[PDB]
Design goal:
The structure holds two protein chains of two kinds. By secondary structure, chain A is mainly α. Chain A has one domain: Orthogonal Bundle (effector protein (NleL) fold), CATH 1.10.4140.10. Helices cover 61% and strands 2% of the residues of chain A. Chain A has nine helices and two strands, in the order αααββαααααα. Chain A has a two-stranded antiparallel sheet with strand order 1-2. In chain A, β1 and β2 form a beta hairpin. The longest helix of chain A has 19 residues. The two termini of chain A are 13 Å apart. Chain B is of the alpha+beta class. Chain B has a single domain, classed as Phosphatidylinositol 3-kinase Catalytic Subunit, Chain A, domain 1 (Ubiquitin-like (UB roll), Roll). Chain B has one helix and five strands. In chain B, strands 2-1-5-3-4 form a five-stranded mixed β-sheet, with helices on one face. In chain B, a hairpin with a 2-residue loop joins β3 and β4. Chain B is globular and about 30 Å long. Chain B starts with a strand and ends with a strand. Classes of the chains: A mainly alpha, B alpha+beta. The interface between A and B is medium-sized, with 30 and 18 residues. Chain A: Belongs to the SopA E3 ligase family. Chain A: This is E3 ubiquitin-protein ligase SopA. Chain A: It is found in: Host cell; Secreted.
Amino acid sequence: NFVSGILDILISDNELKERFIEALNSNKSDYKMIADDQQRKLACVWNPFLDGWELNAQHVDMIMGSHVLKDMPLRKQAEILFCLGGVFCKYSSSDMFGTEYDSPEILRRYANGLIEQAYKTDPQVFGSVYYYNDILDRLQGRNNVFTCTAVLTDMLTEHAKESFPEIFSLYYPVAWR
Amino acid sequence: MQIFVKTLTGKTITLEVEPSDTIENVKAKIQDKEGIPPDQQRLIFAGKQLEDGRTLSDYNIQKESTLHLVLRLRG
């Protein structure tokens, strides 16, 4: 359960941390975070880690030194970072904190910052630059692609499940496969 | 007249507008300036969501008012 570990470090608020960690144990959340007050809440928590759609450099240093990524070879680091982007993509989707037509904008930017960070660590994990850019285009809404993060999440777990199955099995929540 | 549109991260883009502009028209100027399509734009003022048939005057939006933009991307 590497994910509840990382949420423990990332979310200082205990009510919100509780929300995120409880959601790892179910495939569907009926608590949503698309309302304006909720999006500002997330924004307050996660802005210190973001620089637009990218992780900011202080967050990156911190995260690469974490109990989760510190002594790992680049490829694993990248593979681990890829699954975390999938987790925030799920969190943003319609099965978790998102809805059919809306999603928590902040969680999409954090998922994007992790995917982008994974490409910087070892781009081989994606297998094609066109795939890396379709993933970004779907998280960000660019180039008229369908934005559905429920759909994006499937595309990410399918890649993880075939390209790096050990990592995926350990670093992606059991209830969510 | 200038207004400001703030994103969730603190970025502020500025528009030139008239009080009789519709919300469709405002979202269009953001697509001119920032490439964000209108159906991706959830605009807020004073806790109120800016509906598409309406004008800035309809919401008592005035010179140098600041609106909040939250991206509407499907889950």
